[PDB]
Structure 1
Amino acid sequence: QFLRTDDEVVLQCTATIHKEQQKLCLAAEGFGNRLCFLESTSVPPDLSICTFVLEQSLSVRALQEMLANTVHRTLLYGHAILLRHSYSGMYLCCLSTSRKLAFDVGLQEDTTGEACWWTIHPASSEGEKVRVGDDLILVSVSSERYLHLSYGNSSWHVDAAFQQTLWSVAPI
C-alpha cells in the first residue's frame, strides 16, 4: 500500500527518554490557542483532533509557479504537501514564533503562502512513491526547518527545528 492524497492520516513519532519509549500523535484544537501538541497512545485518548487530511500534493516547482504567478493522487518523495486539520479546517503550518532557535507549529486558515507547505523526505530516493509503513521527514517550505519532536520540562512538544524527526504517518 502506498500513501495517496485526499486521505485521513495520523502523524505519529517515537519518543524515548529514560529508556521509556512511547508513540505520540500530532494534534491540535481550533479554539483559542493555535499551537499543536502531542498525545500519548494506547490509540490516543482523543482521536478527532488527531486527524489530518492530505488536501494537496505538488512539486516544489509547481508550488512556486502558482505563488509567483499571483505576485486521490499519490505522494512522491520531494513533493510538498498540505495538511488540513479535520476538526478546525485550518492548516498545519510553520509559525514565526519561537520555542528558542526553533519555530512553533500550529494551525492557520490562510492556505496561501509557503508556511503551510511541507516537503516530504525519505528516512534514507526522491521521486519514488511513498509506501505506507515508511518513515517520513517533513521540511517546512517557508522556514526550511524540520517538523521536530522536542522535549521540555515535563513534556514532549513539536516544533520546527534544525534537527529532524521521523514520522509514522498512517491512515485511520
Structure 2
Amino acid sequence: QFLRTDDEVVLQCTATIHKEQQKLCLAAEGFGNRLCFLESTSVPPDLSICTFVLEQSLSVRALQEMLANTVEHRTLLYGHAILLRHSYSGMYLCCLSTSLAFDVGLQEDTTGEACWWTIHPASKQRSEGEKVRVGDDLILVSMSSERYLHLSYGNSSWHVDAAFQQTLWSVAPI
C-alpha cells in the first residue's frame, strides 16, 4: 500500500533509554498550549488527538513557485513537501520560531513555509520521486527552518522538537 493525500495517519517514533524500548505517537490538543507532545503506545491512551490528515503533497519547486507568486488522492513521493492537518483541531503541524532546537506545534495559516515538511527516506539513497510505501521509515525536514522533526529526551520524558539531528518516523494509516 502507498501513502496518499487525504489518508488519516498517525506519526510514530521508537524511543529507547536504559534498554527500555517503546513506540511513541505525535499528539496535540485542540486548545490551550499549541505545542505537540508524545504519547506511549500499547494503541495510544488517546488516539483521537494523534490523528493527522495528509492534506497536500507538492514538489518543492511547485510549492516555492506558489509561494513566490504571492509576494508583492495522490501518492506521496520522496522529496515532496507535505501539509499535515491535525484532525481534532483543524490546525496544521508547524515549526515554530521559539526554542538549538525550535518548538513544534499547531497553527492555522498555511501560506508560508512553516507548515510544510519534506519527506526523505531513511537510507543513504535520496529515492527522489519514488513512491512512499506504508512500512517505510521517513525523515521529515522543516521547509522553513531546514531542521528535522526530532525526538528529544528531557529530564524524565520524551519530547518532539525541530533540531539539527534526524529521527526516523513511521507514518501509517489508522
**Which band: TM-score by shorter chain?**
over 0.9
| 2:96 aligned counterpart, secondary structure | strand
2:81 aligned residue: 80
Q: Distance in 2 between matches of 1:77 and 1:133?
A: 14
Secondary structure in 2 aligned to 1:96?
coil
Cα distance, 1:126 vs. partner?
1.2
1:138 to 137, 140, 151: 140
> What is the CA–CA distance in structure 1 between the aligned matches of 2:143 and 2:58, rounded to whole Å?
12
Q: Deviations over 1:47-102 (max 9, x none)?
A: 0001000000000000001101110000000000000000110000000111xx00
**1:92-145 Cα deviation digits (max 9, x unpaired):** 0000111xx000000000111000000000011111100100000000000000
Tell whether the 8 Å contact from 1:24 to 1:38 is kept in structure 2 after alignment.
yes
Contact 1:23–1:41 (8 Å) recurs in 2: yes
Q: Number of residues paired by the alignment?
A: 170
Cα RMSD, aligned residues only: 0.4
Greater shift, 18-27 or 123-132, is seen at 123-132
Matching of residues 56-135 of structure 1 within 5 Å = 56-71=56-71, 72-98=73-99, 101-124=100-123, 125-135=127-137
> What is the rounded CA distance, in whole Å, between the counterparts of 1:111 and 1:145 in structure 2?
18
Give the drift of 1:30: 1.8
Cα shift readout 1:14-67 (whole Å, capped 9, x = no counterpart)? 000000000000000121110000000000000000100000000000000110
User: In structure 1, the residue corresponding to 2:65 is in which secondary structure?
Assistant: helix
CA distance in 1, matches of 2:30, 2:44: 18
Runs (4+) off by over 2 Å: none
Rounded Cα–Cα distance in structure 1 between residues aligned with 2:50 and 2:128: 28
Cα distance in structure 2, aligned partners of 1:104 and 1:30:
17
Contact 1:148/1:163 (8 A) holds in 2: yes
Query: Sequence identity of aligned pairs in percent?
Result: 99
Structure 1 SS opposite 2:113: coil
Q: Is the 8 A contact 1:30 1:107 kept in 2?
A: no
What SS does the aligned partner of 1:112 have?
A: coil
Contact in 2 for aligned 1:146/1:160 (Cα 8 Å): yes
Structure 1 gaps of 5+ residues are none
